[PDB]
Amino acid sequence: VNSFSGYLKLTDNVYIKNADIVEEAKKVKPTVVVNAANVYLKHGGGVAGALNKATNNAMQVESDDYIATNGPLKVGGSCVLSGHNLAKHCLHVVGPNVNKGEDIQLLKSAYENFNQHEVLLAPLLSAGIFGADPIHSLRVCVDTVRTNVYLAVFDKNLYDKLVSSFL
Ligand SMILES: Fc1ccc2c(c1)[nH]c1ncnc(N[C@@H]3CCOC3)c12
Ligand SMILES: [Cl-]
């Protein structure tokens, strides 16, 4: 039993809700919140901009030190950093950005990072400003993630479309 409330169950391990991931993280304080990161951990907009803003820029400060030490992530890769006031940990995961020409096949690799954590609160990778089809992202999530994932979808119209079209 966990504290996630109001989710629709899609499969044995995948759950979905129309919610603002920032507000969901602040309420649940999950062990892991997933950020829709880029390789530079520059949290300017989309989910990343919103999560970072909610940490009063502490996420960005920590991220800049991480990059200065380690260099950029790989597309499809991830790193674990602090969750600040939102979660115990933040798993920064880089899905391919279609608006940069990146291979959509890398979306499966990106979701594989979730399997290193038993339970996660997450957005749909590569959705929103990353330019991929969210219906496809949900399909890859369900077919790749085996651990327990709670998906927060900000847009109500999109949430209803994802549920109604789910096979
Ligand atoms: F300021 C922002 C900007 C983007 C998001 C945000 C707050 N909170 C989010 N929570 C979950 N998923 C998100 N990204 C996808 C976009 C379409 O539906 C889901 C966002
Ligand atoms: Cl977005």
UniProtKB/Swiss-Prot annotation:
Macro domain span: 1-167
Topological relation to the membrane, as annotated: Multi-pass membrane protein
Cell location: Host endoplasmic reticulum membrane
Record field: catalytic activity: Thiol-dependent hydrolysis of ester, thioester, amide, peptide and isopeptide bonds formed by the C-terminal Gly of ubiquitin (a 76-residue protein attached to proteins as an intracellular targeting signal)
Regulation of this protein's activity per its record: Inhibited in vitro by GRL-0617.
Annotated phenotype, changing residue 31 to A: In strain: Mu/B.1.621
Complexes and interactors: May form homohexamers. Interacts with N protein.
Summary of the function given for this chain in its UniProt record: Responsible for the cleavages located at the N-terminus of the replicase polyprotein. Participates together with nsp4 in the assembly of virally-induced cytoplasmic double-membrane vesicles necessary for viral replication. Antagonizes innate immune induction of type I interferon by blocking the phosphorylation, dimerization and subsequent nuclear translocation of host IRF3. Also prevents host NF-kappa-B signaling. In addition, PL-PRO possesses a deubiquitinating/deISGylating activity and processes both 'Lys-48'- and 'Lys-63'-linked polyubiquitin chains from cellular substrates.
Protein name per UniProt: Papain-like protease nsp3
Protein's organism: Severe acute respiratory syndrome coronavirus 2 (2019-nCoV)
Top-level taxonomy: Viruses, Riboviria, Orthornavirae, Pisuviricota, Pisoniviricetes
Annotated gene: rep
Shown chain mapped onto the complete sequence: 1025 to 1191 of 7096
